[PDB]
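Researcher: Last one for today. Full complex below.
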Amino acid sequence: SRLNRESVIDAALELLNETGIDGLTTRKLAQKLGIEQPTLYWHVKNKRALLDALAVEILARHHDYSLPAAGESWQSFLRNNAMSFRRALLRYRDGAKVHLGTRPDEKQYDTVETQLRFMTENGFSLRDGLYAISAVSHFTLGAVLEQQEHTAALTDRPAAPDENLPPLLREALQIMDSDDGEQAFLHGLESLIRGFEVQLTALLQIV
Amino acid sequence: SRLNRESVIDAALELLNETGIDGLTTRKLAQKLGIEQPTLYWHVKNKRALLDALAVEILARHHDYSLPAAGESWQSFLRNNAMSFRRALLRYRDGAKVHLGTRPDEKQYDTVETQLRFMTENGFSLRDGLYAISAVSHFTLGAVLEQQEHTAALTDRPAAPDENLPPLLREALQIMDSDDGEQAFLHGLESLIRGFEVQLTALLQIV
Ligand SMILES: CN(C)[C@@H]1C(O)=C(C(N)=O)C(=O)[C@@]2(O)C(O)=C3C(=O)c4c(O)ccc(Cl)c4[C@@](C)(O)[C@H]3C[C@@H]12
Ligand SMILES: CN(C)[C@@H]1C(O)=C(C(N)=O)C(=O)[C@@]2(O)C(O)=C3C(=O)c4c(O)ccc(Cl)c4[C@@](C)(O)[C@H]3C[C@@H]12
Ligand SMILES: [Cl-]
Ligand SMILES: [Cl-]
Ligand SMILES: [Cl-]
Ligand SMILES: [Cl-]
Ligand SMILES: [Cl-]
Ligand SMILES: [Cl-]
Ligand code: NI
Ligand code: NI
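Model: Here's the assembly. Have a good evening.
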């Protein structure tokens, strides 16, 4: 196989879809690529370095809404950015777990600087803007992680007795399982944005 | 060692603090307890069953604010409940990762039924109430997971060059690292609650 960076990342992503993050080993990546391990080591020093790389590439390839359009409202940008982030995390098995614990890579520096600058231009202090942005990121990841781990653990876990369930919980579980979490996610996103908006527009009023 | 359920859970929790969730094996739990594996197997069939159990016990022991006080506002309850959930998740190394993908256990059924009933009593439809509650849970877990995995991965990961950082990102990173994520978390929580409140009070107005 070719072993440029781009090839290795392709094979690692496919492998991730087949095995999830705990099955994503250096030994299995070597087998997928048709090489011995010492050969892989020249290219990929360890699991951490691979995962860091994957975290960036997943967004570089599938996170299309990383920047505000010309004249777009801050509220609209957060909306579009959260939905793009969610789609990119959901594209790969354990995608959100691959993101977790990263911080912006050099390759994302200008992107992430512009996001923060754009909030300050719309009235936010840096710290308030950052808190808004972070809250969107946290909420989005928590929702995707719950969905994805729920899915992967509902194989190991046997049944769920619809018999001794109390009535609202029974109904809540039907609701929750009726889609991919998308509606719950979108409803929450709107709440979060409006909340911010109240905060910003208050200024020094007690609110 | 004694091998009642409570003992096994104690030793598993200590082990979790020492090794994190990926180091929490059946073989190491046997060593900690001074027994052979076949002995442990009689008591604990697999890693999944152990983790499910841990997820419940962590909350049973440290999540004190699971129910509304007498006459407490819905907004106040969500606030107190989110802060209690966060504290309980943060008490153990990888605690939030141990929660992830679970769903309410029989032992929590009445607790979780009362939470949902209490929201419907305050004006929420069941589905709106559930969405609010879920958004709090998701946001809380995302914040705790980012904190905790950031911490555990900032050992494997070498430095972060304060040199070529753009100015707002440099400052945002100083801000973020200034505490445990608590302030960012609390600020976001308030936004989320106010958002809900706008939604509820709108009824059928366009809002
Ligand atoms: C999902 N969205 C809000 C953000 C986004 O669109 C990103 C992107 N590359 O386009 C991010 O890197 C983000 O998805 C992302 O991952 C960010 C993030 O990790 C982060 C951390 O950990 C620490 C400090 C900062 Cl300043 C950031 C931060 C704010 O830049 C966020 C940005 C989000
Ligand atoms: C953090 N807090 C909001 C909740 C809470 O206090 C719980 C608790 N046992 O006291 C939960 O189990 C929760 O922390 C928790 O874990 C819940 C949760 O997993 C969940 C899932 O997965 C599916 C359906 C339902 Cl109806 C629930 C659910 C709403 O009951 C939540 C409740 C939250
Ligand atoms: Cl080739
Ligand atoms: Cl090559
Ligand atoms: Cl500029
Ligand atoms: Cl003993
Ligand atoms: Cl015993
Ligand atoms: Cl009742
Ligand atoms: Ni991130
Ligand atoms: Ni849960």
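The radius of gyration of chain A is 20 Å. The first helix of chain A runs from residue 5 to 19.
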